[PDB]
DNA sequence: GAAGCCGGCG
DNA sequence: TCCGCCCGGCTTC
């Protein structure tokens, strides 16, 4: 299997520099507020050079970058920019999994006829295209599987091209750190460092139940199949970007006949946002006191709007059976696990 | 079934 | 030593 992972470099900052050519070459900080407190979404090259990084509060960012331009996040525009690129990728892939707004896995096995060198060249073709057509730099990773593809891209940021060849995968799996693995963050790394597991190879020698006691069976077998080079799971035609919609109600209420006019509208604005068929719907009721009450059906296959209305109804008609106490202030829907066709 | 509590992570 | 109309997973009522 040949998989190309495309990751977009500091996407929001790059989109802003594109629409606003006078930002280039000068510090730029994209900001994000909540339901208020400001933090850094992304920062451009010269901002990052000053030490500005994601999560940083806005006052703090200002202290170290007073000359920066701070602009508000504009999700809709970044989402549309992403979509054009996702569609560019689509023309090249047997299968494409949209992981998030700036990440996508491409199965190109058939496109390059199993030729790994032709896989590498296609990934070069793709960077050059994204740059030419959309003026964005991306980092790609070409690898025998999804996880390795992500890991090698991560290792080659920014504007890079990471390669792991099937005829050399064992040397990569020998030198691979335990911390450099998806699913292993800063806490789980420390606890594996409590057995003398720094690298991936180490687990093969360790007793299997102890790893399970530190990670759970799900990640235990996950790390094993990786170290053993038996991780298989393919790329499906599915988008992981969630599409949702919320409407404030004219007043706090618990009457289904009152809130449904607004839920139908919520589903409307969501399904019309989709292109594909969601494998999960989530009804989200925000209460008077601003507490959250959500329930979803994980559909084996997909859900159409024709199926969705009464599926979303008895979701709420259960949310209220679950909460006879409080009134709904705001109603929202969430569609995700979308099947691509 | 689902509250609660951890951990990844952007 | 960062909150999320995170999200997923595992424990525990
Ligand atoms: Ca990222």
Domain ranges of chain A: 2-10+75-163, 11-74, 164-230, 241-338
> Distance, angstroms, CA A102 to C1' C4?
19
Active site residue A121: no
Nearest residue, CA→C1' of C4: A34
A159/A16 Cα distance (integer angstroms): 17
Q: Note the CA–C1' distance, A167 to B9, in angstroms.
A: 32
In sequence order, the 6+-apart residues with CB closer than 8 A to the CB of A156 are A139, A141, A162
Omega of the bond prior to A32 within 30 degrees of 0, cis?
no
Method for structure elucidation: X-ray
Q: Give protein residues whose Cβ lies within 7 A of nucleic acid chain B.
A: A 54-55, 100, 182-189, 295, 318, 322
Q: Are A27 and A52 contacting, i.e. CB atoms less than 8 angstroms apart? A: yes
CATH 3.30.70.270 fits A2-10+75-163, yes or no: yes
The integer distance in angstroms from the CA atom of A190 to the C1' atom of C7 is 23
C-alpha dist (Å) from residue A182 to A170, A178, A186, A293: 18, 10, 11, 30
* CATH class of domain segment(s) A164-230: mainly alpha
Detail the residues of A annotated as belonging to a binding site for Mg(2+). Answer: 7, 102
Separation CA A209–CA A213 (nearest Å): 6
Q: Tell me the pairing of strands A243-253 and A328-336.
A: antiparallel
Whole-angstrom Cα distance, residue A288 to residue A169? Answer: 55
Catalytic: which of A17, A97, A103, A134?
A103
Instruction: For Cα atoms A159, A163, A165, give the angle at the middle one, nearest 5 degrees.
Output: 170
For chain A, the straight-line distance linking the first and the last C-alpha, in angstroms and rounded, comes to 21
Lookup: nucleotide whose C1' is closest to A41 CA? B10
- Is domain A11-74 given the CATH code 2.60.40.10 in the classification? no
What was the resolution (in A) of this experimentally determined structure?
A: 2.6
Q: Which fold has domain A241-338?
A: Dna Ligase; domain 1 (3.30.1490)
- Asked if A102 contacts A14 with a C-beta cutoff of 8 angstroms, the reply is no
């Amino acid at each position: 299997m040949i998989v190309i992972f495309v990751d977009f470099d500091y996407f929001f900052a790059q989109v802003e520099e594109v629409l606003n050519p006078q930002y280039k070459g000068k510090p730029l900080v994209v900001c994000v507020y909540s339901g208020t407190s400001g933090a850094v979404a992304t920062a451009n090259y010269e901002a990052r050079k000053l030490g500005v990084k994601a999560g940083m509060p806005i006052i703090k960012a200002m202290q170290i970058a007073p000359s920066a331009i701070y602009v508000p996040m504009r999700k809709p525009i970044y989402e549309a920019f992403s979509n054009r690129i996702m569609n560019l990728l689509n023309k090249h892939a047997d299968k494409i999994e949209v992981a998030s707004i700036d990440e996508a896995y491409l199965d190109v096995t058939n496109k390059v006829e199993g030729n790994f060198e032709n896989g590498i060249e296609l990934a070069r073709k793709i960077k050059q295209e994204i740059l030419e057509k959309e003026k964005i730099t991306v980092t790609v990773g070409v690898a025998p599987n999804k996880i390795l593809a992500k890991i090698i891209a991560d290792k080659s940021k920014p504007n890079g091209l990471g390669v792991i060849r099937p005829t050399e995968v064992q040397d990569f799996l020998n030198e691979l750190d335990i911390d450099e693995i998806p699913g292993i963050g800063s806490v789980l790394a420390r606890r594996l460092n409590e057995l003398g597991i720094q690298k991936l190879r180490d687990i093969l020698s360790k007793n299997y139940n102890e790893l399970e006691k530190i990670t759970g069976k799900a990640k235990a077998l996950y790390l094993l199949k990786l170290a053993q080079n038996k991780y298989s799971e393919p790329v499906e035609n599915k988008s992981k970007i969630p599409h949702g919609r919320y409407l404030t109600l004219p007043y706090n209420t618990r009457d289904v006949k009152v809130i449904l006019p607004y839920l139908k509208k919520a589903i409307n604005e969501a399904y019309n946002k989709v292109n594909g068929i969601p494998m999960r719907i989530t009804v989200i009721a925000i209460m008077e006191d601003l507490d959250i009450l959500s329930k979803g059906k994980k559909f084996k296959h997909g859900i159409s709007i024709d199926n969705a209305y009464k599926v979303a109804e008895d979701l709420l008609r259960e949310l209220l059976v679950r909460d006879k106490r409080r009134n709904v202030r705001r109603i929202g829907v969430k569609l995700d696990n979308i099947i691509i066709n």
